[PDB]
Write a protein that binds this ligand. Structure first.
Ligand SMILES: N[C@@H](Cc1c[nH]c2ccccc12)C(=O)O
Ligand SMILES: N[C@@H](Cc1c[nH]c2ccccc12)C(=O)O
Ligand SMILES: [Cl-]
Ligand SMILES: [Cl-]
Ligand SMILES: [Cl-]
Lengths: 327, 314
C-alpha cells in the first residue's frame, strides 16, 4: 500500500526556486508511488488578519501554481481546506484531547505574541486534524513546524491508547537541490525573507530575475576561480548548485566548463537557465490561472476525494467518542 | 417575522420538574410565537471526559424527553450538534476573531476544549441569526462574549451576524431556600409515582400549630414550595389553592401535590418510552432536524466565508 503524504500550502501565491527545486519538483515525480495530498490551508491563514480580496485571489494563485509545477489532480488529492468540513470538525474534537499547556508553550504562539486571538493559540490542533484525517504516514515539515508535528503524533497516540488504533501516527519525511540566498549564501533561500533581493519567486518577472542573479554575492579570489567549495566560496558554490539543479549538469562538469572564466559568466548562465525554467512554469501558470472554471472543477473534485477519505476517519472518531451516528 | 430563539441542551436526560415547569414547558407553548431551535450539544459534552456509551445513551434520552414534553420537530428545529458540521466550521473561524485574553478571563475557566468552548457556543448561536438565547446565570458571561464577537466581526466585514439578546419557582424538597436542580431534593420527569409520593412525603414543612396551608416564603418555605408545585401543574393560582386547603393539614397538601405531579408525569413518561424505544423514529427526527439546521446554518456560514475572503466551495 502506498504511503500517504500530507502537505499544507499557505494561500500566499508565492513559491521560491528553493521551494521548487528543493522540495516540490521532486514530489511532482513521486505522485505515482505515494498517495500525495496537498491542502491549501485558508483556515490557518485567517489566524492573522487577511485582506479578503487578497486571500481569495492568493488561494487561486497557489492552486494554479501547484498545477503548473506539475501536481496532477488525478493522481494526487489537491483541495482548499475550507471546502472540506471534516477538518474543522476533527479540529474541535481533538481540542478535547489536547492539553492547554501543550498549546500555551508552543514557540510559534510565543513568537506571534494581549492583541492575540484564539486561532493563533489553537491552530496546532487544526493542523493535527488536517494530518490525522487521512491516515497520513508522512508529513513534509520544515524545522519551524517540527513542534507542531510532534503534537499531532502525541494526540494520535493519546487518542489511540484510549479508544484503539484509530489514527496513524505521522512521521516527518524530508527527502533535492541546495538553493541559498543570493546576497547571503550561508542562509537558505526563504520565502519569508524581508530582503526580496535574496529570493527568486517562481512567478517573478524574468527581467527582475536576471537583475537579482547578477547581484549575487561571490568571493574576492584574484583571479576568480569557479569551483565548488561551500566553506570558502559559499556564493560561487550556490550559483553552481542552482545551475546544476536547473540543467542537470554535474558540479564537476560545470567546473571544467568555467575553467578560466569570471564569476560574471557563471551568473549569466545561471540567469538564463533559471529564466528559461520560470518561463515554462509561467506559461502553464497563466493558462491555468485564467481559466477559473477549470480551477473550480479541480477544487470541486479535490474536495470530494478529500471528504470521502476524511469522513471515514471522522466517523470512526465520533463512534469511539460516543456521539450518536448521523443518520 | 418570528424571533429566533436558540437553546443548547446538554445530553443529560435526567430533567427535574423544576427544569420542566420553570423553562421547558413554557418554551413548548412558545413554539408558534418564536422560531425555536434546540441543539443537543454533544460536542460541548466532550470538554469533560465522557464514557462513550453513556454519552450516546444520554443524547437519545434528551431527544426523546424533549419530544415527550411537546417539542414539535416540524414547528421547531431539534437536532444533535455533531450532525451539523457548520457548528465546528464557524467555531474555528470565530476563534480568529476572539481574543485569547477574553477566554482566559472567563470565570468558569485542563484541555483546550474546556478553554475554547465559549467560542463554539458563540458559533452555535450566531449560525442561526439568533435573536434571543435563554441562559442561566452561569452562562451570562458566555452570551456576552457571543455579542462582542458578533459586533466585532460585523464592524470588520458588514452586518453578517445578528447580535443576540438574553431571552414557576420549584425549590429543593429538603432545603427550600435553594432551587431544585442528593436526588431526594429532586423529582425527575421519568420518576415513577411511587418514588414521587415518597419524596414529597419527606418534603420539609414548618411547625405551625395548627398547621396552615398558607403561602409565605419567609416563614413557611416548605409549605409554600408545595403550593408552588401544585399551582404550576394544575394552573390554579396560589390564592385559589389557599381557599381550597382551608382547614386541611400538610398531609392533605402533600397527598394532593403527589397526585397532581404523578398525573402530569404519567403523560410525559408514556410518550417518552414510546419515542425512546423507537430507534427508527428517533433517527428520522435527528435526520430531518439536522437537514433543517444545516440549510439554515449554511446560509450564515457561506456569508461568513465570503466576507472573510475564502474561495467559495464549488
Ligand atoms: N502550519 C503550516 C501549514 C500546515 C497546515 N497543516 C499542515 C499539515 C502538514 C504540513 C503543513 C501544514 C505552515 O504554516 O506552513
Ligand atoms: N453550554 C450550554 C449549552 C449550550 C451550547 N450552546 C449554547 C447556546 C445557547 C445556549 C446554551 C448553549 C449549557 O451547558 O447549558
Ligand atoms: Cl521557505
Ligand atoms: Cl561568498
Ligand atoms: Cl438545573
Amino acid at each position: 500500500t502506498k504511503p500517504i503524504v500530507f502537505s499544507g500550502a499557505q494561500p500566499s501565491g508565492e513559491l521560491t526556486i528553493g521551494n521548487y527545486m528543493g522540495a516540490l519538483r521532486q514530489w511532482v515525480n513521486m505522485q505515482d508511488d505515494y498517495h500525495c495530498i496537498y491542502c491549501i490551508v485558508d483556515q490557518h491563514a485567517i489566524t492573522v488578519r487577511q485582506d479578503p480580496q487578497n486571500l481569495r485571489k492568493a488561494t487561486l494563485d497557489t492552486l494554479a501554481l501547484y498545477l503548473a509545477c506539475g501536481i496532477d489532480p488525478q493522481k494526487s488529492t489537491i483541495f482548499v481546506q475550507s471546502h472540506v468540513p471534516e477538518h474543522a470538525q476533527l479540529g474541535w474534537a481533538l481540542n478535547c484531547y489536547t492539553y492547554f499547556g501543550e498549546l500555551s508553550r508552543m514557540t510559534q504562539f510565543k513568537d506571534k505574541s494581549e492583541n492575540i486571538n484564539a486561532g493563533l493559540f489553537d491552530y496546532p490542533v487544526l493542523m493535527a486534524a488536517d494530518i490525522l484525517l487521512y491516515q497520513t504516514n508522512q508529513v513534509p515539515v520544515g524545522e519551524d513546524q517540527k513542534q507542531h508535528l510532534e503534537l499531532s503524533r502525541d494526540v494520535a497516540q493519546r487518542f489511540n491508547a484510549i479508544y484503539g488504533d484509530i489514527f496513524k501516527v505521522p512521521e516527518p519525511f524530508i527527502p533535492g537541490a541546495r538553493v541559498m540566498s543570493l546576497l547571503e549564501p550561508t542562509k537558505k533561500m526563504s520565502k519569508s525573507d524581508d530582503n526580496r533581493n535574496n529570493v527568486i519567486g517562481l512567478l517573478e518577472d524574468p527581467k527582475s530575475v536576471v537583475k537579482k542573479i547578477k547581484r549575487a554575492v561571490t568571493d574576492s579570489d584574484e583571479p576568480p576561480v569557479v569551483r565548488y567549495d561551500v566553506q570558502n566560496k559559499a556564493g560561487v558554490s550556490n550559483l553552481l548548485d542552482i545551475l546544476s539543479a536547473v540543467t542537470g549538469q554535474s558540479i564537476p562538469e560545470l567546473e571544467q566548463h568555467f575553467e578560466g572564466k569570471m564569476y560574471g559568466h557563471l551568473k549569466g548562465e545561471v540567469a538564463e537557465a533559471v529564466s528559461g525554467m520560470l518561463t515554462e512554469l509561467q506559461e502553464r501558470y497563466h493558462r491555468f490561472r485564467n481559466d477559473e472554471a477549470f480551477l473550480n472543477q479541480v477544487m470541486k473534485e479535490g474536495a470530494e476525494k478529500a471528504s470521502a477519505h476524511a469522513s471515514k476517519t471522522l466517523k470512526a472518531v465520533y463512534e469511539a467518542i460516543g456521539f450518536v451516528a448521523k443518520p
